[PDB]
Symmetry: D2
Subunit: 187 residues, 4 copies
Amino acid sequence: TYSIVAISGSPSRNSTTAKLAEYALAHVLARSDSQGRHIHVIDLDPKALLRGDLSNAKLKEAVDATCNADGLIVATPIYKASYTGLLKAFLDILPQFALAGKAALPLATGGSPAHVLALDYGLRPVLHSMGVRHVVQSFFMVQSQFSLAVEDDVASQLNNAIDHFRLSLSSEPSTRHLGHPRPSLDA
Amino acid sequence: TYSIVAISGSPSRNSTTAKLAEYALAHVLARSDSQGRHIHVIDLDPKALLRGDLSNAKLKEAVDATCNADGLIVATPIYKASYTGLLKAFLDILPQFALAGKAALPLATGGSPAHVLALDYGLRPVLHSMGVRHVVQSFFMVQSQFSLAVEDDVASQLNNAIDHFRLSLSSEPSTRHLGHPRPSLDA
Amino acid sequence: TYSIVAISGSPSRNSTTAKLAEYALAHVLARSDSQGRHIHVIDLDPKALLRGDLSNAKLKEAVDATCNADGLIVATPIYKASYTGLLKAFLDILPQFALAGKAALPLATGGSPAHVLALDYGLRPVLHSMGVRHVVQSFFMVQSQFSLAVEDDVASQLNNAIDHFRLSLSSEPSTRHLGHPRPSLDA
Amino acid sequence: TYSIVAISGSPSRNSTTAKLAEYALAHVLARSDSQGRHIHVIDLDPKALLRGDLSNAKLKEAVDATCNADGLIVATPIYKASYTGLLKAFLDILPQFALAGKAALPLATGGSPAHVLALDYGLRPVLHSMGVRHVVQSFFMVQSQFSLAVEDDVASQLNNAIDHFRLSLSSEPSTRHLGHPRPSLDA
Ligand SMILES: Cc1cc2nc3c(=O)[nH]c(=O)nc-3n(C[C@H](O)[C@H](O)[C@H](O)COP(=O)(O)O)c2cc1C
Ligand SMILES: Cc1cc2nc3c(=O)[nH]c(=O)nc-3n(C[C@H](O)[C@H](O)[C@H](O)COP(=O)(O)O)c2cc1C
Ligand SMILES: Cc1cc2nc3c(=O)[nH]c(=O)nc-3n(C[C@H](O)[C@H](O)[C@H](O)COP(=O)(O)O)c2cc1C
Ligand SMILES: Cc1cc2nc3c(=O)[nH]c(=O)nc-3n(C[C@H](O)[C@H](O)[C@H](O)COP(=O)(O)O)c2cc1C
Ligand SMILES: Cc1cc2nc3c(=O)[nH]c(=O)nc-3n(C[C@H](O)[C@H](O)[C@H](O)COP(=O)(O)O)c2cc1C
Ligand SMILES: Cc1cc2nc3c(=O)[nH]c(=O)nc-3n(C[C@H](O)[C@H](O)[C@H](O)COP(=O)(O)O)c2cc1C
Ligand SMILES: Cc1cc2nc3c(=O)[nH]c(=O)nc-3n(C[C@H](O)[C@H](O)[C@H](O)COP(=O)(O)O)c2cc1C
Ligand SMILES: Cc1cc2nc3c(=O)[nH]c(=O)nc-3n(C[C@H](O)[C@H](O)[C@H](O)COP(=O)(O)O)c2cc1C
């Protein structure tokens, strides 16, 4: 059984990004032998999050869940041509090579199609510094497009991205450290 | 009189990044007709910061100060090959073209020299989405180097960067909107 | 008198990018005391360019012209979510801190609005490694938009970008080395 | 049998980058059922390369070989904080989603450790615009380090990167289009 964790980083209530992540999570679970959690970073304790205070039980649980995941869905709205500070604050408290062995699917929504590359240029290098095993294609959606109530061509791309994410999940213990630069120094 | 604002984003106490920003701020003030403030993002109210709650007076004051600055010193440690979530959380609550008319100096410290480009590839595009007028060269310092108790060649580069920052400050009202894509839609 | 040099990097004949650069060059020259050249990288000798062979007179002249410019207009179509290899091949043969003291205006055309950030994330850091003094806002145009036969809002942004470029040009000998990390090691 | 293609992009003779790519290619071939080619972009016809002239037989063969590869080793020296124009010129003539279904290993050498992130921030997004299936961790080496005559810790990282590359190769026809946004529009 794969353990899939979704992490969404909008600081606003009624997040369309969160709906996108939830959609992706349900899609993967309907087609694989998986369990899931959805970490809404906005629902973590702000003081504990910014201070990396792992005596906060809910924050510690979120971190542990991410560390135990076989795949991560990482979703953010685009703020100022990049990922949210809220999402990055969460990534900052994971251990150094937290993503070793893991697959990942980067998702975003934005107000403008001008900022599609924020995922590939901004978020992707961050995940690769955490030793991630396999980050599949990014998917970005413009605000308006969404309502699976979305345009056909857009829906095909999203579904293909989520399919690829699911196909890239690994059971095998041999892959657990892949992505780490020095796999015998743990992972 | 120029108004200079420094913003430092380490979430850790006893921040060397903060010492770097303070050094840069003092350097500029000793050589120009300027006033300064140093916003330590860690000292802002975490809940209010993450929620963009401007009824918090100290947060509102920080935002206003940034909006009134002629120059910004933006300093962060490198976390996960990029700027901190803490710093980005602060940038996220500034208005859309908050940096129109302004000069900026990007500063960072990091544990490894491998991540020098995090400023130019990560932070610089963020400032440019906020309509910044003039971002001078980045300066990055490796942890060890610091203690102006720092290596000669390193010190020359830092000082040149801060000099350039100071020389790039503008008094003229005509430059107030430069950097904004549509300067008559305010700034 | 300012010396302005435009560099356009499409490898295709009938380049709309070239027309954009020529437009920007004429705009600056009509409003400042300036001379101009337009280097079409496609018109340089391919063997000499790829080998950095400065015994080719036309290639050497192009390099010298760039080194003597007060401002550079650097224009490229977007290929594979970045600047062209053709343009980069030219930038690769300039000396290490070739752009010290200079202003620069990054321009691009692309088939899709999805790749606007290729300038800020891809080209801007390259110019900053060459010690550039002042790179103003990027301007990107989608293929269709062009024909000053272009949409009003788009035209305003382009013109504002070119205005800012012109305003940022410096006469003063004191600015000649600004941008260089060690200005007394020449520039 | 996997078909592995190495592409090295230094424009200088006696390229250490080429030696790195050749080393990686031999490493993969010694541990998997594979054939290999090494495309030295410098050895392609400069005029034909810059013009994308596929009536040049050697250029056409290189492009076809890349399109038929199950894995690509893409190696470049760092020039001006990014990949070479020479390498990018070659990538520019591949079809739009040329890398669909493929694994890739990004390699670089550079004079300074300051530019490690040029791979993750610069090259990685380019490959992802070509629909690549799986790009494993980057490896960067500083000039001095090289002579497998290299430092132990450095050698471990390189070998782990190449191991991961080899493990990520896919035989299965089902993976042939993975990475493409619309896999039924070919690949
Ligand atoms: C403070 C702020 C900054 C934003 N910056 C951008 C931006 O740089 N680019 C963009 O395409 N949209 C930007 N947006 C629009 C959001 O990305 C868009 O509304 C997104 O879908 C919000 O998703 P959410 O409901 O999950 O919060 C911004 C929105 C806010 C509130
Ligand atoms: C490339 C790199 C990545 C690092 N990543 C992490 C990390 O993810 N988590 C972490 O706690 N420390 C990380 N560190 C280092 C230590 O956290 C940090 O250097 C140490 O706590 C010393 O801090 P100080 O000497 O400035 O007080 C990293 C260091 C380097 C060089
Ligand atoms: C959670 C964490 C992640 C880090 N990631 C990096 C990194 O990706 N690259 C790096 O050179 N240093 C990394 N470091 C090291 C810090 O950048 C370095 O210690 C910095 O000087 C801390 O500055 P400060 O005292 O202001 O907090 C990390 C440190 C921590 C605690
Ligand atoms: C490129 C871009 C940048 C933006 N930047 C900001 C911003 O800095 N601050 C902001 O409040 N809104 C920004 N917005 C947009 C609005 O904040 C946001 O679209 C609006 O609140 C609608 O959100 P919703 O429709 O998803 O609820 C930006 C939009 C775009 C397209
Ligand atoms: C080989 C090739 C690759 C291209 N890649 C992109 C791309 O990644 N993104 C984009 O928006 N347009 C891409 N385009 C479209 C061009 O950017 C667009 O047509 C541009 O305006 C051409 O400008 P030019 O006439 O000066 O050559 C590509 C075109 C070609 C021929
Ligand atoms: C950050 C950095 C930038 C450099 N930029 C240039 C450059 O622009 N032009 C140049 O000729 N050499 C540049 N060099 C270095 C030399 O060109 C190069 O190291 C030297 O020719 C030695 O090559 P080899 O030892 O691999 O043969 C740079 C080195 C570093 C570390
Ligand atoms: C024109 C030129 C520009 C260079 N720019 C950089 C640079 O920005 N950063 C860096 O670490 N090294 C730079 N170097 C150094 C090369 O990356 C280094 O020498 C590399 O190992 C050369 O590899 P090669 O033998 O395959 O050609 C540059 C070298 C040259 C000749
Ligand atoms: C994102 C994107 C990527 C593209 N990539 C390629 C490509 O790799 N190769 C290519 O030949 N054309 C690519 N194109 C488009 C066509 O090559 C190009 O638009 C067409 O030849 C029209 O050029 P023109 O209308 O400026 O003359 C791309 C377009 C877009 C929007």
